[PDB]
Every structure is written in C-alpha cells, then in structure tokens.
Write a protein that binds this ligand. Structure first.
Ligand SMILES: Cn1c(=O)c2c(c3cc(Nc4ccnc(Cl)c4C#N)ccc31)N[C@@H](C1CC1)CCO2
Ligand SMILES: Cn1c(=O)c2c(c3cc(Nc4ccnc(Cl)c4C#N)ccc31)N[C@@H](C1CC1)CCO2
Lengths: 131, 131
C-alpha cells in the first residue's frame, strides 16, 4: 500500500520523497545541520545549502563556485523583499506556495532573481487571470 | 498542470519533492557538498548528513549527538553487508528499492540496524510470500 512496482524493476515508495522533505523542514525548524545564513535586507534565514541548490538556479551557481561554496553567509540583492524570500524558502522545503494578491509581485520578482522558472511562470498565469 | 489547490490555502507543486530528491542524488553522484563518508567493511560511501538523518533513525541519532555531529567519517558495524548498505543508500536518494532474492536478507538486516522500519516490514512481507 505504501509501495508499488515502478516502471523499472524496483519497488518504489510513494511517500518517500515528500517524507524526506518533511524531515529536512523539521531539521530547518530546529536549526539542525543548517550551514548557511541568507541575509535579505535586515532579515536572516538559516537553511541547508543542498536544499537551496536543489531549488534554485542562483543558489546552484553560488554553491558550485569554488570560492563561494565555503561562505557561511550569503547576502542577497537589497531590492529583494524578505517576505517574498520567506514564502519561496518555505516553498523549497514544503512544495507549498503561499501566493496571495498582496505578495504575488514580490514573490515573482524574487523567483526571477533566484531562478525558479516554473514559479515565475505560475505567478505570471495568476497575474494574467486578473487582467 | 504542475500544481494544484492543496487542502489548505496554498497551491502545491506535484513533482517538487521528487525533483528535489533527484537534484540531491545528482549532487551525490558529482560529490558536491557531501559532508560524510560512511565506511562499511572495506567500502566507503560519500553522502549528505541531512539526507542520511532524514532517512534513518540510526543516522538521526548519530548526527543529532553533540559529539558525533562533527565527525567526517562514520564506521558502521563490520557485520553490515556493503551491497545491502549501497541498495539502501540508493533508496534514500531515489525512493526506489532494488530488492531481489539474492539481496533481501542483507537489505533487511541492514534496514533493521539503520532503523528504516517500513523497509524492514516490506522485506518481511516479501520473505513471507515465499514461505
Ligand atoms: C532553473 N531552476 C529552476 O527553475 C528550479 C530549480 C532548479 C534547480 C537547480 N539545481 C540543480 C540543477 C541541476 N543539477 C543539480 Cl545537481 C542541481 C542542484 N542542486 C538548477 C536550476 C533550477 N529547482 C526546482 C526544484 C524542484 C527541483 C525549484 C525551482 O525551479
Ligand atoms: C524510524 N525511522 C524510519 O523508520 C524511517 C525514517 C526515519 C527518519 C528519521 N528522521 C527524523 C525523524 C524525525 N524528525 C527528524 Cl528532524 C528526522 C530527521 N532528519 C528518524 C527515524 C526514522 N525515514 C524514512 C524517510 C522517509 C522519511 C525512511 C526510513 O524510515
């Protein structure tokens, strides 16, 4: 019931990937093995570099750079809205995007900067439905 | 199409968790930001501590211990079969378990040791179907 025959030979566990992500978000909530602080304006966000790279073209580029991969603090562009970054950071660790009329422009601009392309496309579609 | 209305207010992205896990497995394949070596008998396996903790009660206990969380090399019980550990390490990063008649006893014993309880239950069910 919790597993099935995959297209390939292996048995596959249906909820495995979502349960791993839930545990990584629990580690983040408890500040366990977090290895970077992202600073956006006056706010700081602790996270795991591997989750950030897995969820963003900008962080993938930063953490694969031989000089920047060892930095413990990353400062983002001061024009980035911290609420918009917070919504996208929660999305990275949960798959859930808290998109609302009052935050959609900041979330879209932050997703463009972070290189989260399907999030940008989704924001655009929601904006287009209003116009 | 790639998203839906979650039971809660947020929109949710269907493939997000499995795509994050795919990227973490790509980082492992390329040896990027791996922070531990697990030694099983004569073999070494590089991995990310966060993925190991998220997938195992034993690694969760080790990496939350104030003394052991800083270790770069973890040596497992020499009775653990490296092929069995390799199959479970691949499962952690993919959701796919390569269970076969020739490896099921080693995979089950290694999952008991690593505290991966639904994997043990699944192994037991497959063994019971043969008897
Ligand atoms: C452009 N872009 C996205 O538009 C994007 C990304 C995204 C992720 C990456 N990282 C990688 C890519 C390839 N290979 C490796 Cl190893 C890595 C790593 N680490 C690079 C670019 C990415 N991740 C998604 C997550 C569901 C996967 C959310 C946001 O959308
Ligand atoms: C017993 N047991 C399992 O039987 C198990 C586990 C498993 C995982 C943990 N880690 C945690 C638990 C709670 N809270 C936190 Cl933060 C962490 C962490 N990190 C602890 C015990 C675990 N993970 C599954 C993965 C799909 C989640 C695969 C194997 O089955």
């Amino acid at each position: 019931n919790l597993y099935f025959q995959g297209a390939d030979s292996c048995i596959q566990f249906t909820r495995h990937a979502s349960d791993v992500l839930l545990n990584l978000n629990r580690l983040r909530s408890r500040d366990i093995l977090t290895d970077v602080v992202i600073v956006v304006s006056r706010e700081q966000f602790r996270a795991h570099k591997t989750v950030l790279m897995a969820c963003s073209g900008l962080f993938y580029s930063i953490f694969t750079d031989q000089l920047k991969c060892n930095l413990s603090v990353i400062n983002l562009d001061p024009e980035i809205n911290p609420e918009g970054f917070c919504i996208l950071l929660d999305f990275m660790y949960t798959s859930r995007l808290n998109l609302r009329e009052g935050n959609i422009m900041a979330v879209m601009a932050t997703a463009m900067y972070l290189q989260m392309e399907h999030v940008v496309d989704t924001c655009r579609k929601f904006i287009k439905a209003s116009e």
